[PDB]
């Protein structure tokens, strides 16, 4: 048939963290002339189109499910054959049957039931990641990120706390950032250091030994 879509049947992502399924569709026109919009839709599998609300969609006026708003979001371009649903903030809620759907015009309408998607969400392992130079020098000021691999910021903002006794000498105001800079001590070498991230409840921290030197 005309009507065929491109992406892999299954996937997963670790609950607060987002995947990105790549995806393509083709679907028989009637082109020339006229040019009426190209309105594509994610829905849950079971749901009817007519009256249901987008898991993610390109129609300003379709309403979409307030538990994906801002979550699930259609990329790249339509115009395009592309219908890539990047899926972010993974909550275990998302676990389940996905189908696709086309409509252009009076005559284009399809749900592609054939090339459903499996939303699989599993529990959070990853841990985040302190990154310094590596100078780890004593009397001199460093700067320390800590980051998620695979995060997006399309879900309510990260949030950090670094934790270890080389962290008392400062201040608890701006233990709060992501990044952090520091001036180490004697104490400090051989102390445990740690960074705990949040989605505004999750156990994500990433805990390092301090090699201070010098």
């Not at 987002?18 to 309105?39: A, D, G, I, N, Q």
């Not at 995060?151 to 270890?164: M, N, Q």
């Not at 608890?172 to 950032?177: K, L």
Request: with cysteine.
């Amino acid at each position: 048939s005309v009507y065929e879509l491109q992406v892999q049947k299954s996937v997963t992502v670790q609950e607060g963290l987002c995947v990105l399924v790549p995806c393509s569709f083709s679907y028989p026109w009637r082109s020339w002339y006229s040019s009426p919009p190209l309105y594509v839709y994610w829905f849950r599998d079971g749901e009817i189109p007519y009256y249901a609300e987008v898991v993610a969609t390109n129609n300003p006026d379709r309403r979409v499910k307030p538990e994906t708003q801002g979550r699930f979001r259609l990329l790249g371009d339509v115009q395009k054959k592309n219908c890539s649903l990047s899926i972010g903030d993974a909550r275990m809620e998302d676990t389940g049957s996905y189908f696709f759907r086309v409509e252009r015009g009076r005559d284009v309408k399809y749900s592609y039931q054939q090339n459903k998607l499996n939303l699989e969400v599993t529990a959070l392992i990853e841990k985040p990641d302190i990154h310094f130079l590596e100078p780890l020098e004593s009397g001199r000021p460093t700067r320390l990120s800590c980051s998620l691999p695979g995060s997006c910021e399309a879900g309510p903002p990260l949030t950090f706390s670094w934790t270890g006794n080389a962290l008392s000498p400062l201040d608890p105001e701006t233990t709060r950032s992501s990044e952090l800079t520091l001036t180490p001590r004697p104490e400090d070498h051989g102390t445990n250091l740690t960074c705990q991230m949040k989605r505004q409840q999750v156990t994500t921290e990433r805990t390092v030994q301090l090699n201070v030197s010098l």
